[PDB]
């Protein structure tokens, strides 16, 4: 009922801000395709640009989540900054193709493991790919990926929140909504919901190493990080 509506709003929010792999015209590039290097500049340029576009979509997504824009502006910002890498990493891993060991970005750009490494992932590469491989067999749909993204974002344990209890309260209906949706879709598998939740814990771990990678990449890249990336991650 009221749970049904919350699910539908979150499904729509995600679907409308996230093109699926099947919808995209995959294309490749020859850029350092086979040799691991510390950084490929042309790949970094494409990757950072796509990242900027994805952050914009993530904000659009957040604004469609019930109650999000009712939080203080300071808390909306704090939540978005804290969840930024978690959501980006979830999104790119959602477009993993095992056969060629590739991930596909929102414009269709399809990079292999070596190119992902070369683009900026560096020491993060194998962990991110491990995550993608463990995500895939869960067979999540838009509602489930959308809900997990929302649960990751609307988290009351983030440092520097003005109203953490209020954030906790807003998260409660999302956890309930996912629990009831997952058991509807997969009645035979009651172990699915907690296995879904531990992806968040995995994501948190990866994004912590991600913040370390932001540091080391800044030393490697030619100029400065793009302004929006700076706002989110600095």
């Amino acid at each position: 009922p009221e749970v049904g509506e919350l699910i539908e709003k979150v499904r729509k929010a995600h679907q409308e801000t996230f093109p699926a792999l099947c919808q995209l015209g995959k294309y490749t590039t020859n850029n350092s395709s086979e040799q691991r290097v510390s950084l490929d500049i042309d790949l970094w340029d494409k990757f950072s640009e796509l990242s900027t576009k994805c952050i914009i979509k993530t904000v659009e997504f957040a604004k469609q989540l019930p109650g999000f824009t009712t939080l203080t502006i300071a808390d909306q910002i704090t939540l978005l900054k804290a969840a930024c890498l978690d959501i980006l990493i979830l999104r790119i891993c959602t477009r993993y193709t095992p056969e060629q060991d590739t991930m596909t970005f929102s414009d269709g750009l399809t990079l292999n493991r070596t190119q992902m490494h070369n683009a900026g992932f560096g020491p993060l590469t194998d962990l991110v790919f491990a995550f993608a491989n463990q995500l895939l067999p869960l067979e999540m749909d838009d509602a489930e990926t959308g809900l997990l993204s929302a649960i990751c974002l609307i988290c009351g344990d983030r440092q520097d929140l003005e109203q953490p209890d209020r954030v906790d309260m807003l998260q409660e209906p999302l956890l309930e909504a996912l629990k009831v949706y997952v058991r509807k879709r997969r009645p035979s598998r009651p172990h699915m919901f907690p296995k879904m939740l531990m992806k968040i814990t995995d994501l948190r771990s990866i994004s912590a190493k991600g913040a370390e990678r932001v540091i080391t990449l800044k030393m490697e890249i030619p100029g400065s990080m793009p302004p929006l990336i700076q706002e989110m991650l600095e």
């Binding site: 904000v59 910002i77 302004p227 706002e231």
Partner: peptide, 10 residues
């Protein structure tokens, strides 16, 4: 957070 503020309004 100039850009983020702008995006949050729109």
């Amino acid at each position: 957070h100039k850009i983020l503020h702008r995006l949050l309004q729109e």
